[PDB]
Amino acid sequence: FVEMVDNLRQGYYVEMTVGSPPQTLNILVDTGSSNFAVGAAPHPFLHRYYQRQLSSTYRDLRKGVYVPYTQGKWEGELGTDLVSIPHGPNVTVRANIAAITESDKFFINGSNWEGILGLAYAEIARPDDSLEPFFDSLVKQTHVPNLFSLQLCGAGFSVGGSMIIGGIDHSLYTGSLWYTPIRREWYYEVIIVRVEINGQDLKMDCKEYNYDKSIVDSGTTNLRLPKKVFEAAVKSIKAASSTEKFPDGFWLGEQLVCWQAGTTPWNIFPVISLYLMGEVTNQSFRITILPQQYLRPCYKFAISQSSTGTVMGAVIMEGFYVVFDRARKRIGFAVSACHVHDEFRTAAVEGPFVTEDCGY
Numbered sequence: 001f002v003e004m005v006d007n008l009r010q011g012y013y014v015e016m017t018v019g020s021p022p023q024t025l026n027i028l029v030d031t032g033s034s035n036f037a038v039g040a041a042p043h044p045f046l047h048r049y050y051q052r053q054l055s056s057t058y059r060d061l062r063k064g065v066y067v068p069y070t071q072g073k074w075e076g077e078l079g080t081d082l083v084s085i086p087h088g089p090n091v092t093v094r095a096n097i098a099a100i101t102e103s104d105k106f107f108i109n110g111s112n113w114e115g116i117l118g119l120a121y122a123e124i125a126r127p128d129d130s131l132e133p134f135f136d137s138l139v140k141q142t143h144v145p146n147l148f149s150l151q152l153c154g155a156g157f158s159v160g161g162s163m164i165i166g167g168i169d170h171s172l173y174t175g176s177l178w179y180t181p182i183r184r185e186w187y188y189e190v191i192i193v194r195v196e197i198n199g200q201d202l203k204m205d206c207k208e209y210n211y212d213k214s215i216v217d218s219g220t221t222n223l224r225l226p227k228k229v230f231e232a233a234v235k236s237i238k239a240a241s242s243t244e245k246f247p248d249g250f251w252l253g254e255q256l257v258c259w260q261a262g263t264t265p266w267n268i269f270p271v272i273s274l275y276l277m278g279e280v281t282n283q284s285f286r287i288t289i290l291p292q293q294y295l296r297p298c299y300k301f302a303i304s305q306s307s308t309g310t311v312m313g314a315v316i317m318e319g320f321y322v323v324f325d326r327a328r329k330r331i332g333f334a335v336s337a338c339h340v341h342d343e344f345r346t347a348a349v350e351g352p353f354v355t356e357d358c359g360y
């Protein structure tokens with residue numbers, strides 16, 4: 001069964017091997033992109049990298065990739081090689097690999113990963129949708145079911161977790177698995193039908209929550225909310241946590257806030273419930289997150305403003321077991337075996353609630 005439990009370890013990475021003989025690398029698990037991209041030239045921040053010349057099973061595709069973004073970029077050439085996940089399914093797959101030769105502001109100092117595993121769909125793959133993403137190759141080439149699960153655990157008092165490919169490990173979650181449909185197969189896009197802060201509805205038009213789009217992204221730390229929703233959220237959090245106040249550099253995710261050891265007044269901060277569209281249009285279900293999740297360890301406010309829609313990143317995925325059921329075009333949520341909570345409140349997955357349009 002699961003040689004896959006605790007296979008995850010500044011982001012969550014899994015161990016993979018590339019080439020022949022196998023070249024061990026640490027690879028970020030990223031549900032918000034679709035390239036399998038690995039460092040393949042020396043970098044100050046890289047202590048190891050993919051060396052194509054050492055791979056007997058490397059094939060050049062004679063094609064480059066260029067990926068600029070607001071801050072830096074990555075460039076490399078495209079090839080294919082044999083790819084395994086030692087603590088995953090016992091298979092080897094020929095997958096596309098973007099060998100990164102030049103980059104800036106891509107690799108992180110001390111992160112411990114040398115590449116990225118894009119688990120989203122072909123539509124958003126570089127340079128275009130013809131470059132089959134890794135998981136697409138995996139399913140087609142092997143008998144692994146078109147599904148994977150993510151249990152991100154965080155710190156608690158270095159991060160750990162499990163990535164279960166081709167199935168659902170029932171020992172990883174508690175209670176009920178609730179599914180929200182994948183709206184479109186590009187990012188893992190979903191629809192948020194309502195949000196409340198401490199049971200208090202933001203009462204905004206449904207479309208504001210998905211203003212542009214809403215995605216589930218393991219490669220983002222924060223819960224990122226569209227401008228209008230962010231401002232409403234922080235106003236509601238500031239009010240609930242009014243008894244003794246913080247600098248506004250804290251609310252913008254710049255400044256940290258410290259108490260000592262265990263005095264931390266968690267119950268001063270409110271819970272956040274995200275209601276996601278159910279499989280029955282009319283039906284919905286909530287995902288409730290504690291301050292233990294949106295205040296990440298001294299703590300930083302891990303909710304930030306977005307200009308590209310809602311991003312449900314790591315801080316909301318932690319404490320939930322998240323199933324990426326590509327086969328049935330849906331994403332399941334269940335309370336995780338590892339969720340961090342106090343003796344008064346718990347992360348929750350509850351439903352149904354009956355509630356639209358909402359899609360932007």
Ligand SMILES: N=C(N)NC(=O)Cn1c(-c2ccccc2)ccc1-c1ccc(NC(=O)c2cccc(Br)c2)cc1
Binds near residue numbers: 035125
């Ligand atoms: N939006 C995503 N989910 N993923 C990306 O944008 C992937 N990506 C790309 C990229 C852009 C387009 C296509 C293919 C790749 C460039 C730089 C990153 C890139 C690389 C690493 C990280 N994340 C982290 O380093 C990280 C740091 C702390 C916590 C966590 Br969780 C992640 C984010 C983006």
